[PDB]
Amino acid sequence: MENFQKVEKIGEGTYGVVYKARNKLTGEVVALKKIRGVPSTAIREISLLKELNHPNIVKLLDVIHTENKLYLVFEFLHQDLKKFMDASALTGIPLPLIKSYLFQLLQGLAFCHSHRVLHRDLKPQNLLINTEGAIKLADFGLARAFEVVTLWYRAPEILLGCKYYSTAVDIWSLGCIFAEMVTRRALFPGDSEIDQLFRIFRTLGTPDEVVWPGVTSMPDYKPSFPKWARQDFSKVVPPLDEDGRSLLSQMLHYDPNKRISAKAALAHPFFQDVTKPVPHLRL
Numbered sequence: 335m336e337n338f339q340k341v342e343k344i345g346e347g348t349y350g351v352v353y354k355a356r357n358k359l360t361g362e363v364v365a366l367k368k369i370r371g372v373p374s375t376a377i378r379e380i381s382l383l384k385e386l387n388h389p390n391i392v393k394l395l396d397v398i399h400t401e402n403k404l405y406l407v408f409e410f411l412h413q414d415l416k417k418f419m420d421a422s423a424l425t426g427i428p429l430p431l432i433k434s435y436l437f438q439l440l441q442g443l444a445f446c447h448s449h450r451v452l453h454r455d456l457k458p459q460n461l462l463i464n465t466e467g468a469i470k471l472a473d474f475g476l477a478r479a480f481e482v483v484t485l486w487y488r489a490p491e492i493l494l495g496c497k498y499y500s501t502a503v504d505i506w507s508l509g510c511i512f513a514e515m516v517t518r519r520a521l522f523p524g525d526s527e528i529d530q531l532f533r534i535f536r537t538l539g540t541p542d543e544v545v546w547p548g549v550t551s552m553p554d555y556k557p558s559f560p561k562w563a564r565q566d567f568s569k570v571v572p573p574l575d576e577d578g579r580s581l582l583s584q585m586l587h588y589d590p591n592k593r594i595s596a597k598a599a600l601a602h603p604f605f606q607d608v609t610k611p612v613p614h615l616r617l
């Protein structure tokens with residue numbers, strides 16, 4: 335913490351505050367994260383993430399454990415997807431770029447998932463982009479090792495009390511982000527766990543044993559939940575073509591076991607014509 339000249343506070347996260355900082359030694363600019371004695375288990379878990387390198391994952395540079403304090407040093411990126419989406423609010427993000435970012439994110443998740451590492455809290459603020467047209471996932475693996483908290487991207491099984499969620503929860507969140515980029519409106523903007531759940535039910539229909547075997551036996555499932563019918567996807571995400579809609583529906587299946595995997599999603603027809611355009615960024 336003495337070797338860094340904190341520039342600005344980049345924002346608070348689920349596990350701590352992140353600052354843009356300059357390494358007094360190397361002179362390099364990095365993202366410094368102060369985790370909110372430090373469990374040895376976490377120490378070892380973190381060290382593991384340090385050897386998890388991939389083009390679409392924010393690189394963990396150093397783990398500083400001193401004075402019973404824990405700081406993580408990450409590579410610094412140009413902007414986050416939420417800020418980019420806001421700046422593109424009036425015209426929306428061009429489809430070629432949306433398709434490019436989704437393709438890369440799926441590559442990143444396929445990599446994490448193959449190493450059995452889940453995110454569990456994907457959201458646009460956690461996705462970082464640079465001037466080169468790349469996009470990377472931040473916070474990967476911190477959930478395992480370690481007021482107004484956004485619930486918009488949380489999978490149904492987590493809201494229903496399932497304690498052993500799988501990699502499928504990340505696919506759900508990505509599905510929600512995908513729809514948001516296309517329509518420019520959050521898909522399920524709930525303000526509470528039950529409101530979130532009901533917004534999901536009102537759009538995709540109240541789940542039952544037919545579409546999701548075992549759902550009525552979930553810890554927080556109530557037989558008294560209202561019975562809403564499923565809406566047409568053409569209504570939910572109007573501007574998306576049929577290949578896009580078919581992919582999205584597979585990412586938003588209620589049953590975690592039927593939900594498409596990142597690996598299989600990479601082979602979907604939607605990515606047939608994928609390219610890598612450069613975004614116009616205002617830094």
Ligand SMILES: COc1cc2ncnc(Nc3cccc(O)c3)c2cc1OC
Pocket residue numbers: 344345347348352365367392408409410411412413414459462472473
């Ligand atoms: C130019 O702005 C930003 C640049 C960033 N560069 C690297 N990491 C970030 N965040 C990060 C890294 C690991 C865990 C975590 O919770 C968050 C950033 C966020 C920014 O803006 C929000």
